[PDB]
Design a protein around this ligand. Sequence first.
Ligand code: MG
Ligand code: MG
Ligand code: MG
Ligand code: MG
Ligand code: MG
Ligand code: MG
Ligand code: MG
Ligand code: MG
Ligand code: MG
Ligand code: MG
Ligand code: MG
Ligand code: MG
Ligand code: MG
Ligand code: MG
Ligand code: MG
Ligand code: MG
Ligand code: MG
Ligand code: MG
Ligand code: MG
Ligand code: MG
Ligand code: MG
Ligand code: MG
Ligand code: MG
Ligand code: MG
Ligand code: MG
Ligand code: MG
Ligand code: MG
Ligand code: MG
Ligand code: MG
Ligand code: MG
Ligand code: MG
Ligand code: MG
Ligand code: MG
Ligand code: MG
Lengths: 152, 117
Amino acid sequence: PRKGPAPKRPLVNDPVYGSQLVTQLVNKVLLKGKKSLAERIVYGALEQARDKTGTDPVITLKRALDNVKPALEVRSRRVGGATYQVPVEVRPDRSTTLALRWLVGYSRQRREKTMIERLANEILDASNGLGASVKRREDTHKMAEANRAFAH
Amino acid sequence: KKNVPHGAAHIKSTFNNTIVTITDPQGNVIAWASSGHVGFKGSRKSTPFAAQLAAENAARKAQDHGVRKVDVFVKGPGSGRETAIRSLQAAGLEVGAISDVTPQPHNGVRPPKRRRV
RNA sequence: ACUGCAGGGGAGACUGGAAUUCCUGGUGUAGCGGUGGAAUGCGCAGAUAUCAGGAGGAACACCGGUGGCGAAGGCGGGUCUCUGGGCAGUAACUGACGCUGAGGAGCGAAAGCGUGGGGAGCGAACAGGAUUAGAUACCCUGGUAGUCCACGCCGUAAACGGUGGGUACUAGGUGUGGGUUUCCUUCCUUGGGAUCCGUGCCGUAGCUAACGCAUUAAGUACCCCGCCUGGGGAGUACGGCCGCAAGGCUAAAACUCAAAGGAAUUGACGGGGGCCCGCACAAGCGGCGGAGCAUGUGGAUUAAUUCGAUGCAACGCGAAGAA
Ligand SMILES: [Mg+2]
Ligand SMILES: [Mg+2]
Ligand SMILES: [Mg+2]
Ligand SMILES: [Mg+2]
Ligand SMILES: [Mg+2]
Ligand SMILES: [Mg+2]
Ligand SMILES: [Mg+2]
Ligand SMILES: [Mg+2]
Ligand SMILES: [Mg+2]
Ligand SMILES: [Mg+2]
Ligand SMILES: [Mg+2]
Ligand SMILES: [Mg+2]
Ligand SMILES: [Mg+2]
Ligand SMILES: [Mg+2]
Ligand SMILES: [Mg+2]
Ligand SMILES: [Mg+2]
Ligand SMILES: [Mg+2]
Ligand SMILES: [Mg+2]
Ligand SMILES: [Mg+2]
Ligand SMILES: [Mg+2]
Ligand SMILES: [Mg+2]
Ligand SMILES: [Mg+2]
Ligand SMILES: [Mg+2]
Ligand SMILES: [Mg+2]
Ligand SMILES: [Mg+2]
Ligand SMILES: [Mg+2]
Ligand SMILES: [Mg+2]
Ligand SMILES: [Mg+2]
Ligand SMILES: [Mg+2]
Ligand SMILES: [Mg+2]
Ligand SMILES: [Mg+2]
Ligand SMILES: [Mg+2]
Ligand SMILES: [Mg+2]
Ligand SMILES: [Mg+2]
């Protein structure tokens, strides 16, 4: 707004996995107020990841997030008779938000059957550095790199 | 295949481009990489980023010919006028002295008319 | 008249350096140039860049200002030659010889014209590119006359202080240029005071429609000159004078309008300025515009399709119930 920043809301740890990362994940998956359904989907995805890799699911999730988190975004601006992209730094919480959004958005449009297994596959591919979520981060970094001239 | 231990750096920084040329103390050019020579074109050639890229290119090309220290002569109302010096410094060269040699007429030739933009 | 003083006042001759352009040569390699963004353009046959040498023209950074000089237009690189005016002091000289000035004469920015020369840069016309609906423009790349010099012509400018010349008088305050001058004469201070001549700001009386002017009057008076008489038509036609031409000067009428104007006030507006705000944008989430149906409206149709609502602020609105 115009009158400075606004207070942001706090979140509580997830009972089964004592992290706020999975709470943010369920809040990203949540639609139409179906928070129990979103929690079911996230829990099923984490369980499938654990049963397929052996590794701790929240550790796998942190690896995937570290893979997909960006560092420079490309906010657009207009100067004269032309408008061009300006690369700016990304703050950490915005980076986590954007990475989670990318994961869920790209898993929603994967060629599989249920959202649980779609999201599990997307998380595993991101942790390995293969998925479209990682491709998105790489494209963002390339566009921020190919416009360093306009770093005013 | 040359070897000139001490040289001079001329940085011409205009409103539209920047050119860095490295010469021996007698005025013979060694290497000259400029902003357009580095991959750039149009109005991007005036940005300081392009200036420092051109400065790096010229500095390394001259080091390949054996230059260790350059004296700097800058001229022009450009923006990369200091970024080029900084890149010359932190690309493996020591500069020492810096001179200003922008040509100043003693009220000589008539300039072009003022733009009514 | 004498003695000092300040000055880009004027004319002529010679002469200096910075820079731009070009030419010759060296180094050197792929770009340069240009814009809001580009393209035309130049270059790869060796450009731009950089170094040395050369040619040529024009304008004179710092000093430099609000400051100086000139009747005005105008005048600044330096030196020499010739030449005009101003101020102060003295009071030596003449003894009203003054002021203004119809006509007239002279000078008079720039553009323009003639004859001859010169031509770096800039740059009407002209050409291409771009923008645009178009772009005979603005922006870009080129580019002729011209701009420069000699000798003539032209005689106009918002040629402006939008204020004719001369003279006397009517509180001050505060800068700055040129003199003279006691005293404080060292208080070295080149300060203060007094006086004369300039050039600015601010202010009383007074004046003005107001804005403002205000000892440099737009105040108080006197002398002479020019000019005005509603707005257009029109500074135009015809006649004449001048000019090579462009054109300049003197200068009407018919007809037509009931206004045209000057200052200042309140608002509104601005692709003016400053500050501030709103789901205004930004960051997000979900939609509508595509499909089927419901409802309202336009149009069409009908015997009737009752009437009203019509940008935001009419259209699931009047209608919270038309067989
Ligand atoms: Mg002469
Ligand atoms: Mg030439
Ligand atoms: Mg050459
Ligand atoms: Mg050259
Ligand atoms: Mg007598
Ligand atoms: Mg007279
Ligand atoms: Mg007369
Ligand atoms: Mg004459
Ligand atoms: Mg002329
Ligand atoms: Mg002529
Ligand atoms: Mg002609
Ligand atoms: Mg001629
Ligand atoms: Mg030109
Ligand atoms: Mg032009
Ligand atoms: Mg054209
Ligand atoms: Mg006149
Ligand atoms: Mg004048
Ligand atoms: Mg007049
Ligand atoms: Mg008078
Ligand atoms: Mg008078
Ligand atoms: Mg005075
Ligand atoms: Mg009156
Ligand atoms: Mg006044
Ligand atoms: Mg009056
Ligand atoms: Mg006439
Ligand atoms: Mg006639
Ligand atoms: Mg008015
Ligand atoms: Mg306003
Ligand atoms: Mg938005
Ligand atoms: Mg829709
Ligand atoms: Mg629809
Ligand atoms: Mg109706
Ligand atoms: Mg409505
Ligand atoms: Mg409604």
